[PDB]
Amino acid sequence: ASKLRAVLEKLKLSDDISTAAGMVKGVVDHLLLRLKCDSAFRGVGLLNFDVMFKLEVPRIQLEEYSNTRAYYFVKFKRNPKENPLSQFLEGEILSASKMLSKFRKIIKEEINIMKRKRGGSPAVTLLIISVDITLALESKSSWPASTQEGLRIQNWLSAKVRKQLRLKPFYLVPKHAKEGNGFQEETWRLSFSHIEKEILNNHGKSKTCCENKEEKCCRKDCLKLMKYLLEQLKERFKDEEHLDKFSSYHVKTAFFHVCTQNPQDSQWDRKDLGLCFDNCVTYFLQCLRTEKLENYFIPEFNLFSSNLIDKRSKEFLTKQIEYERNNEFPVFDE
């Protein structure tokens, strides 16, 4: 626990943000106005680095692509008078690739530097400090059926809170599902990143959790230490390529499942940081070992499927995390 707090303090040194928070916001506010000048993106807005540009399209018709519960076709009638989105249409299907092409195009045309990310990234990444800008369609309708059994927060947060969250919009990002050989350029993937950030900043059973010195839980610390553990092993195994499929979103997903398993705030008492971090570490090990990491909002989408991450990669990380646990986490030294 002394080492774990030493790492958190080592990760706390990074006031560079207060000046860099006003830096990236200047660029986002710029591209937010120039994009509003294009007919197709007049009506784009900031959702509430990883940035999300939302664009509400009324009466979006969704069609679950294949049997995957997360990727969808966006059906859209051409007829709506003066449609600025007709350039992205192919019959009834609203192409995710086409809209992302022109979205990337306009951003690149604004000079006042990008680099394509690995195959499938729905974002536009701008280096200056690194930024991620993702286009997202906004639907104010009910969440798709694949999310019916997701968001298992009833015993942690309230059932009251789940009903409120599921009344909020959901989003689709131009992340395409793979056809094995290549991708399906028309499909979008669901995104609940706005809900993800609500449950992280309002994370306790008590509404006043972390609002006073009596109720300082260590939930955020455990996720920080979980994210940092994966970041460090991936850096040491940089040229390994076995850890390239594992991202901090896997860690975040696993952390959410542990929160559902430990709903009480006394299970995250900061007097037990080492024990709470170990709960996160062991649950993530079972996920690798059983090859199962359900999406928190889409239960039947397995992030640890062999279709996405091979069995060799999962066991390789299992060996490394088991080592780090068995030796008081040496990667947290210095």
Ligand X SMILES: Nc1nc(=O)c2ncn([C@@H]3O[C@@H]4COP(=O)(O)O[C@H]5[C@@H](O)[C@H](n6cnc7c(N)ncnc76)O[C@@H]5COP(=O)(O)O[C@@H]3[C@@H]4O)c2[nH]1
- Residues in the annotated binding site for Mg(2+): 50, 132
Task: Indicate the residue among 219 and 250 with the shorter CB distance to Zn ion.
Answer: 219
Question: Where do we find the tokens 């059926």?
Answer: 145
Question: Where do we find the tokens 């900031």?
Answer: 46
The residues in 220-259 that bind ligand X, with binding defined as CB under 6 A, are: 247, 249
Beta strands 44-46; 61-64: pairing state = unpaired
Residue 191 interacts, among Zn ion, ligand X, none and using kind-specific CB cut-offs from 5 to 8 Å, with: ligand X
The amino acid at residue 260 is: T
Binding site as annotated, residues for GTP: 132, 189-196
Q: DSSP labels for 253-310?
A: HHHHHHHHHS-SGGGGBGGGHHHHHHHHHHHHHHHHHHT--B-SS-TT-BTT-TTTS-
Please state the closest distance from residue 14 (CB atom) to Zn ion, in A: 22
Please state the closest distance from residue 173 (CB atom) to ligand X, in A: 5
Q: How far apart are CA 250 and CA 192, in angstroms?
A: 14
* Cβ atoms of 73 and 63 closer than 8 Å: yes
Output the CA–CA distances (angstroms, integers) from residue 276 to 90, 210, 270, 327, in the order listed: 51, 16, 8, 17
- For Zn ion, the binding residue among 57, 209, 285, 331 (CB under 5 A) is 209
Q: Is residue 64 a contact point for ligand X (CB under 6 A)?
A: no
Task: Indicate the residue among 144 and 204 with the shorter CB distance to Zn ion.
Answer: 204
Give the number of other Cβ atoms within 10 Å of residue 9's Cβ: 9
Task: Indicate the residue among 20 and 209 with the shorter CB distance to Zn ion.
Answer: 209
Using the rule CB under 6 A, give the single segment among 37-45, 114-122, 280-288, 326-334 that binds ligand X: 114-122
Please state the closest distance from residue 263 (CB atom) to ligand X, in A: 23
Please state the closest distance from residue 231 (CB atom) to ligand X, in A: 11
Using the rule CB under 5 A, give the single segment among 98-106, 207-215, 287-295, 305-313 that binds Zn ion: 207-215
- For Zn ion, the binding residue among 122, 144, 174, 204 (CB under 5 A) is 204
* Cβ atoms of 317 and 85 closer than 8 Å: no
Q: Is 186 helix (H, G, I), strand (E, B) or coil?
A: coil
Binding-site ranges for Zn ion (CB under 5 A): 204, 209-210, 217
Contacts with ligand X, residue ranges (CB under 6 A): 50, 117-118, 120-123, 132, 134, 173, 175, 191, 193, 247, 249
